[PDB]
Amino acid sequence: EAPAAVVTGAAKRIGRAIAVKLHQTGYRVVIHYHNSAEAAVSLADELNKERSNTAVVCQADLTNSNVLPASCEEIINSCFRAFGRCDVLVNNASAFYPTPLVGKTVETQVAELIGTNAIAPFLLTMSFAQRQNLSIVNLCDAMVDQPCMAFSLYNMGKHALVGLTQSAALELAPYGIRVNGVAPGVSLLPVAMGEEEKDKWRRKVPLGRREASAEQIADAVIFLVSGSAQYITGSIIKVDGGLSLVHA
Amino acid sequence: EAPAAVVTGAAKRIGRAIAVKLHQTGYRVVIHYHNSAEAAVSLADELNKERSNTAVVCQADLTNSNVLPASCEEIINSCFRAFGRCDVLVNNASAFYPTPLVGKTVETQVAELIGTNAIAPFLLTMSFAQRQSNLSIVNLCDAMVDQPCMAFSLYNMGKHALVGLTQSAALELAPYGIRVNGVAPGVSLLPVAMGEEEKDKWRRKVPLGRREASAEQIADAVIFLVSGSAQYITGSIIKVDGGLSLVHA
Amino acid sequence: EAPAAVVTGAAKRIGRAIAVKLHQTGYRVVIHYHNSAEAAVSLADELNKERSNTAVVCQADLTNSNVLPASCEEIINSCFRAFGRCDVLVNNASAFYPTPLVGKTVETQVAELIGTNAIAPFLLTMSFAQRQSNLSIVNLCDAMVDQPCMAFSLYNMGKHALVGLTQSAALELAPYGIRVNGVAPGVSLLPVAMGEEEKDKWRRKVPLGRREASAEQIADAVIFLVSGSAQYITGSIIKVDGGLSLVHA
Amino acid sequence: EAPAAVVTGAAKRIGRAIAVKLHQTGYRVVIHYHNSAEAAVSLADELNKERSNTAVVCQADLTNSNVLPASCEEIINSCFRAFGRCDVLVNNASAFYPTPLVGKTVETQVAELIGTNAIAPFLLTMSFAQRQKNLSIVNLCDAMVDQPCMAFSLYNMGKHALVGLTQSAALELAPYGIRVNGVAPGVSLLPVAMGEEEKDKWRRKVPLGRREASAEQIADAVIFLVSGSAQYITGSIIKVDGGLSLVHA
Ligand SMILES: NC(=O)c1ccc[n+]([C@@H]2O[C@H](COP(=O)([O-])OP(=O)(O)OC[C@H]3O[C@@H](n4cnc5c(N)ncnc54)[C@H](OP(=O)(O)O)[C@@H]3O)[C@@H](O)[C@H]2O)c1
Ligand SMILES: NC(=O)c1ccc[n+]([C@@H]2O[C@H](COP(=O)([O-])OP(=O)(O)OC[C@H]3O[C@@H](n4cnc5c(N)ncnc54)[C@H](OP(=O)(O)O)[C@@H]3O)[C@@H](O)[C@H]2O)c1
Ligand SMILES: NC(=O)c1ccc[n+]([C@@H]2O[C@H](COP(=O)([O-])OP(=O)(O)OC[C@H]3O[C@@H](n4cnc5c(N)ncnc54)[C@H](OP(=O)(O)O)[C@@H]3O)[C@@H](O)[C@H]2O)c1
Ligand SMILES: NC(=O)c1ccc[n+]([C@@H]2O[C@H](COP(=O)([O-])OP(=O)(O)OC[C@H]3O[C@@H](n4cnc5c(N)ncnc54)[C@H](OP(=O)(O)O)[C@@H]3O)[C@@H](O)[C@H]2O)c1
Ligand SMILES: COc1ccc(-c2[nH]c3nc(N)[nH]c(=O)c3c2C#N)cc1
Ligand SMILES: COc1ccc(-c2[nH]c3nc(N)[nH]c(=O)c3c2C#N)cc1
Ligand SMILES: COc1ccc(-c2[nH]c3nc(N)[nH]c(=O)c3c2C#N)cc1
Ligand SMILES: COc1ccc(-c2[nH]c3nc(N)[nH]c(=O)c3c2C#N)cc1
């Protein structure tokens, strides 16, 4: 029987490349999405064309609220309903925007940034464990200790996620569930970003003066879920071309 | 004129010793508390007996919610209302209890553990900076954040987020002359509801003296970070753990 | 043409497992050894028996001394002499024994513990880079470097230095397309001098399976780092420790 | 009786300020020096003018060699000879220069850079602890250890080794009541050799004030750690970097 994976925010960019590479490895995939219905569906049809009945989609908002635990439970439940098992959880979905200290209310920013980056991964982890080569892979950030100016909530969420990865690895090890992170430095830059600002970041990267492809990020996820990683838990693998090593 | 400090969860235990030492150093103090009303008032009484009009209490629930921004604004506002200034913020208040992955709802556990340990400190930092000498913030972190207690994921998540806040806020507020630092206990005053057997188990693990830090030892490190002897320290987290975090399994 | 790799201390245990797996991946291999001549020649025989002219041995002491740079240069030269290229360097060889602060002279212990774990890796890295596609270096580190064993200060100093080299060399050799990474075991193959009981005590502290890593499990992570699947990875140290580093005292 | 302290490389710059501040706090001091005889004696004169027979100088090369262990044993002995006790050791002396991977032989650079930054502090630590069975050791580390200067592999290896020594020694010496901590400057007094324009490039990177730390700001952190206010603190490394290490490329 083919194993199954849930990948959150899988419609586009890194999460898409993760879903694709997992599918190519032989995984059936639950493609979670929030706003990107058309892209999520186009991905599912592409993958089902490859092998029928191997891809489904799951819509949920991952903002923190009093319904988020039920939403996260439902996303895990969807994988079991589609595929009768859930072997891999990838916490990829992420809100990302500045929140300076000095039109969204602040409580909404907290809900979105802490919810997507930290609380939803925690609830999903809970649901995943309660329902049981099992592992969870969290998309972290190589630059968590050298954060972007005015990104306190985002950075707090990514720091929290490190704590989740470590705490869950310890707690779930007896159940044989491994929990690891992949930490991009600069990968796919925002779509709006002018090439000239993209280049300011690219130039900082020691290995090649370029950003990671989504596929390069996905390669590290693939390693962490594979049988080549079966003693690996609580580890966060930077995929950053040495960017985090560069002083000011 | 005397500087003023806000200390959250300052009615008992470590927050209280921090409040007292700040007061002995010359600070007027806002004693924030949540449930410990009697203890809060008793401390203000004590401190005001020593120097009149140098201590006030301020009640707030620091659980995460849509009104938490208002509560945090009001804590900082109460420092200005009492003392005309706010020089020091100490983020001490914290919920601490297990939340295993396998009688409160999970929603409530998220709100309390993430609210008190991370979100309220962020909002307090925001309100503090916006109302702005030697200005600084001290966050009560955890020396064991990368070697966490089993089944404490939400607690450990909040303390990890707090590290991120300390670093992010240090960077962003440095242009305003506001320093932001941490003090990270290993084992200090042990939980009231911890059994004496577990207490002694923790004590035996500490290389330096086989005992927990007194509240006053933790407070001493807070005092250093807010002092003139720390004017170039920002984004630093000082472990006060007697070497506990260095001890392998 | 098949790529070529140098593995230090490759005669036995983890070094052998990396050498074997690299060879199974299609590398030709320089099996470096110090005292274990028979085991190193036995491995080379086995590997050549699988594919003719794909393995050679190379004897060298990696203790620090004024000729260590010539020795390390010679190890790289040996790979080029045998195979006409050198694609991968794995720094595995390591002295490991206690050096309490309170029959070897202390200067010999420094030379052996710092030489094998840090200086030789640095000299080999220099020689490797100077002689230069998927070029990389992998350094066998220690997951427990921040939670060290009692009385192993020089060994721990050496492994910490190795972390700095990993990061320093990743930064400086990135323009040359040489990636530099580490793999950090927790407990893998226990020391042969360790009795089963002391072995079991270590085994029992591992959250993931309560067992040590097989030599193969360590080799799997080396194989990933040198692969095309890790082409953007440099300066990273991958723990392969079953959660051991996360477990508090 | 007044306590006594050893400060290595104490003739100038940061080591000088540490020595002055320790003396002002009431310590008698051993001023160690290698080349700076004139300056070491000048500081001695100034301190002894303040309180008679409270400062002595001590000459040693701290480069790694066969005689280094004897040299370090003698630095510690000089403190006992002068003052009948040795309460504090500050490992400040340091060689600092590039050693690109791709003048001095490389083994001489290993000897100086790893010797001064790591091996000498290890040997001094041994000699300090042995003569015992508020004692502490403070090591001068580097806030930028994980974001090193380009082409400074050996230096960076030495400072990483020093972090390892700090933690290993804290663990091993805790049962003796000897605390072991570090202070990690970012940019303080810029190297005299450094060009003026490059000095200003570094200053402008510092979030807190866009300036370097004075030597006295570094010393302030040393003073805290050796004080009774840091009595539960061991294995801690306090950054004094004005946020510098927080700033991304
Ligand atoms: N790209 C980089 O340079 C970089 C660098 C460091 C770390 N990372 C991390 O790597 C991961 C992938 O990065 P990325 O650039 O591919 O991410 P991204 O495009 O910025 O976001 C990924 C997806 O997250 C989902 N999302 C946002 N808000 C949500 C909400 N409220 N509820 C549910 N889903 C929500 C979105 O789904 P919909 O489109 O369906 O609405 C989005 O497509 C992220 O975790 C990120 O933090 C990336
Ligand atoms: N004690 C240790 O060994 C240790 C170890 C590591 C880290 N720390 C950290 O050091 C700090 C002080 O430790 P501690 O043991 O003194 O803390 P504590 O007694 O467990 O908590 C301090 C105060 O936090 C307040 N608090 C809890 N929930 C709150 C809420 N929902 N809203 C507002 N306030 C709330 C409580 O105030 P009221 O009583 O008024 O209700 C409580 O007295 C904490 O941040 C802790 O995480 C302590
Ligand atoms: N075993 C574990 O649980 C564990 C845990 C953490 C890290 N590690 C790291 O992983 C790596 C492999 O571990 P291991 O247990 O397989 O190592 P090991 O058996 O203790 O040592 C591997 C080889 O190092 C070589 N070596 C020792 N001194 C040397 C010298 N002066 N000059 C040249 N070579 C010398 C020896 O070669 P000869 O036999 O030919 O003389 C030895 O076979 C090491 O770097 C180790 O520090 C292992
Ligand atoms: N200044 C900074 O921005 C900065 C930044 C990060 C870390 N640090 C650390 O803080 C400490 C003080 O820095 P600094 O700039 O004051 O240091 P420094 O001037 O570069 O060196 C201090 C002293 O070290 C002694 N020294 C050098 N080589 C020696 C050897 N082979 N044997 C014995 N002594 C030797 C010298 O003594 P003699 O003059 O008597 O020959 C020198 O005056 C150092 O450990 C340094 O790495 C400083
Ligand atoms: C301080 O360095 C960085 C650089 C990029 C990022 C980064 N994080 C992101 N998270 C999401 N969800 N989407 C993104 O595009 C990014 C991103 C970038 N670029 C974070 C820290
Ligand atoms: C894994 O080691 C520890 C030990 C103690 C603690 C700890 N955190 C606390 N937070 C609050 N608010 N109150 C406490 O008593 C503690 C506590 C302890 N003990 C955390 C991690
Ligand atoms: C604190 O946990 C550990 C456990 C094992 C080791 C360890 N390091 C070694 N290095 C060499 N060269 N050979 C070994 O066998 C080990 C070893 C073990 N076990 C170090 C720290
Ligand atoms: C990457 O940022 C830095 C900044 C300063 C230093 C630094 N290290 C030193 N060591 C000695 N012995 N003397 C020095 O002046 C410095 C120094 C500087 N500046 C190192 C790394």
UniProtKB/TrEMBL annotation, chain A:
Active site per database record: 154 (proton acceptor)
Coverage span on the entire protein: 103 to 369 of 369
Top-rank taxon: Eukaryota
Stated name of the protein: Pteridine reductase, putative
Top EC group: oxidoreductase
Alphabetized GO MF terms: nucleotide binding; oxidoreductase activity; pteridine reductase activity
Gene that specifies this protein: Tb08.26N11.790
Family stated for the protein in its record: Belongs to the short-chain dehydrogenases/reductases (SDR) family.
Modified residues (Cysteine sulfenic acid (-SOH)): 58, 148
Amino acids binding NADPH: 13-14, 34-36, 61-63, 92, 94, 158, 187-188
